[PDB]
Amino acid sequence: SQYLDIVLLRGSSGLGFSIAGGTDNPHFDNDTSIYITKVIPGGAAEADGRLKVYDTIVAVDDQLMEDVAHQVCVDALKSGSEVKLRVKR
């Protein structure tokens, strides 16, 4: 529908958003995608302004997240002074 690349500089509190989903822990019914579930006021992602709630995380750096477990994507995001996000919306 629309793919976008977004680069975030990690802040003192991390990236300032939350995610749910994955092959091990779907967030919707029979949906394994990793979705953005919250963008925190005052965090790096909100300051950037581009990330939206329910964006699908397609890739983190050069690592695709389309059929992966939750903690895999978590490790990509949490470990990393600058992180390149490819998302779908």
């Binding site: 991390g14 990236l15 958003f17 939350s18 995610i19 749910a20 822990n25 967030h27 579930t37 919250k38 925190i40 939750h70 978590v74 995001l77 949490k78």
Partner: peptide
Amino acid sequence: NPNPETSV
């Protein structure tokens, strides 16, 4: 339950 989530 629905509350599994991770903040990053």
